[PDB]
Design an enzyme around this catalytic site. Structure first.
Site, PDB file in Angstrom:
ATOM      1  N   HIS A  68      53.849 136.574  19.733  1.00  0.00           N
ATOM      2  CA  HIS A  68      53.271 136.533  18.366  1.00  0.00           C
ATOM      3  C   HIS A  68      52.603 137.875  18.019  1.00  0.00           C
ATOM      4  CE1 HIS A  68      53.816 132.093  18.800  1.00  0.00           C
ATOM      5  NE2 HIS A  68      54.231 132.267  17.549  1.00  0.00           N
ATOM      6  N   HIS A  72      57.347 140.722  16.294  1.00  0.00           N
ATOM      7  CA  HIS A  72      57.704 139.404  15.706  1.00  0.00           C
ATOM      8  C   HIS A  72      57.620 139.470  14.172  1.00  0.00           C
ATOM      9  CE1 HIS A  72      58.170 135.210  15.022  1.00  0.00           C
ATOM     10  NE2 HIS A  72      56.949 135.128  14.495  1.00  0.00           N
ATOM     11  N   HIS A 106      52.748 136.739   8.294  1.00  0.00           N
ATOM     12  CA  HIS A 106      52.736 135.265   8.516  1.00  0.00           C
ATOM     13  C   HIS A 106      52.019 134.899   9.824  1.00  0.00           C
ATOM     14  CE1 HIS A 106      55.995 135.614  11.383  1.00  0.00           C
ATOM     15  NE2 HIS A 106      55.805 134.332  11.668  1.00  0.00           N
ATOM     16  N   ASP A 107      51.871 135.822  10.786  1.00  0.00           N
ATOM     17  CA  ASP A 107      51.232 135.529  12.100  1.00  0.00           C
ATOM     18  C   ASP A 107      50.048 136.465  12.369  1.00  0.00           C
ATOM     19  OD1 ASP A 107      52.295 133.223  13.251  1.00  0.00           O
ATOM     20  OD2 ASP A 107      54.040 134.298  13.970  1.00  0.00           O
ATOM     21  N   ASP A 217      61.317 132.727  10.792  1.00  0.00           N
ATOM     22  CA  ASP A 217      60.349 132.551  11.907  1.00  0.00           C
ATOM     23  C   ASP A 217      61.067 132.188  13.208  1.00  0.00           C
ATOM     24  OD1 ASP A 217      57.809 132.754  12.942  1.00  0.00           O
ATOM     25  OD2 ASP A 217      57.224 130.720  12.404  1.00  0.00           O
ATOM     26  N   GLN A 269      65.414 124.079  25.945  1.00  0.00           N
ATOM     27  CA  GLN A 269      66.080 124.869  24.872  1.00  0.00           C
ATOM     28  C   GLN A 269      67.128 124.016  24.147  1.00  0.00           C
ATOM     29  OE1 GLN A 269      65.461 128.296  23.595  1.00  0.00           O
ATOM     30  NE2 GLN A 269      63.598 127.503  24.533  1.00  0.00           N
TER      31      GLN A 269
END
Ligand SMILES: Cn1cc(C(=O)N2CCOCC2)c(C(=O)Nc2cc3nc(-c4ccccc4)cn3cc2C#N)n1
Ligand SMILES: [Mg+2]
Ligand SMILES: [Zn+2]
Length: 313
Positions: A68, A72, A106-107, A217, A269
């Site tokens: 993050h 990113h 956004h992060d 994202d 996953q």
């Protein structure tokens, strides 16, 4: 004014593709971002001096966490740039302006911990924001940086246009709460299948922009297998550190965050691609047909994860 950012030939061509990796040179990422704003939004959207100063304040406010992080934020902005460039006429002037900014922000000031761990830790942020805790924080950081002197990249917008772009950004960043994605995709699925989906209905647009934020994202799963596989390692480095902190609070973490269950990663996953990633890009492709390459890339990476389980790599 007549200063176009350009990129080397290989970057100039590949930056247009959904699967573009922004590369390991941190110093090129700011210019990669300005290039995308100039081509997506125009060279008139932002005062270059205010934008460059806004970008470095946003860079300085991401932390050196494994996933993050600043890389990113620029990765997620690139995916949005690709969606916007393949869906040129479907989006307003304010939307292209707001959404690349929203992605880059956004992060903001992420600590590498989930909303869950803040709530169980009893972080101050969990008292101030009871749901979408980190996402309300990310939007609040974004407003803080715009209000630094020299940093208001929206200065030339009217009072009404200003309130609208900050509302797009807010919804855009709240939408990156994966807890809100499940209900958002189901409603878009229903509105597309029944046939009531209406891009003139503002509440409908919000939902579409929401799914695009999830799409951008999660975009590590739409890359070349080596990018997808190595990003996974940085994703699990944060999850397993959160697991460790959970254990320190006397709580067994979910298997996803337990480093003692590394063996079960390939199966974890499969769940994620089937429960989250593939549904996300399918509904996205149905609503925005030219985003099909994200769905094709995602299915390809799910196939790569099945090979890991079969022991063939
Ligand atoms: C690109 N990208 C984004 C995410 C992502 O999720 N987020 C973005 C970062 O912030 C939190 C959300 C992922 C991802 O890998 N997600 C998950 C992995 C996973 N492994 C197991 C697992 C592992 C071992 C055993 C059992 C289950 C469960 N499980 C659930 C998941 C989900 N959802 N990939
Ligand atoms: Mg986030
Ligand atoms: Zn993110």
């Amino acid at each position: 004014g007549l200063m176009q950012f350009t990129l080397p030939v290989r970057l100039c061509k590949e930056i247009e593709l959904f699967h573009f990796d922004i590369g390991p040179f941190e110093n090129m990422w700011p210019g990669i971002f300005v290039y995308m704003v100039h081509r997506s939004c125009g060279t008139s959207c932002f005062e270059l001096e205010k934008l460059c100063r806004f970008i470095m304040s946003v860079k300085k406010n991401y932390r050196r966490v494994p996933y993050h992080n600043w890389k990113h934020a620029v990765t997620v902005a690139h995916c949005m740039y690709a969606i916007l460039q393949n869906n040129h006429t479907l989006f307003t002037d304010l939307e292209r302006k707001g959404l690349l900014i929203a992605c880059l922000c956004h992060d903001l000031d992420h600590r590498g911990f989930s909303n869950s761990y803040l709530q169980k830790f009893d972080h101050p942020l969990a008292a101030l924001y009871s749901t979408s805790t980190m996402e309300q924080h990310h939007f609040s950081q974004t407003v803080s940086i715009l209000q630094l002197e020299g940093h208001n990249i929206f200065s030339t917008l009217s009072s009404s246009e200003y309130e609208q772009v900050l509302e797009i950004i807010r919804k855009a960043i709240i939408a990156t709460d994966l807890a809100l994605y499940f209900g958002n995709r189901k409603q878009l699925e229903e509105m597309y299948q029944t046939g009531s989906l209406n891009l003139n209905n503002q509440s409908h647009r919000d939902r579409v922009i929401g799914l695009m934020m999830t799409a951008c994202d999660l975009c590590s799963v739409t890359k070349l297998w080596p990018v997808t596989k190595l990003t996974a390692n940085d994703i699990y480095a944060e999850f397993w550190a959160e697991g460790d902190e959970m254990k320190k609070l006397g709580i067994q973490p979910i298997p996803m965050m337990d480093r003692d269950k590394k063996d079960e990663v390939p199966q974890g996953q499969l769940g994620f691609y089937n429960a989250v990633a593939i549904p996300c890009y399918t509904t996205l492709t149905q609503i925005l047909p030219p985003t099909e390459p994200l769905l094709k890339a995602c299915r390809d990476n799910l196939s790569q994860w099945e090979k890991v389980i079969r022991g063939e790599e």
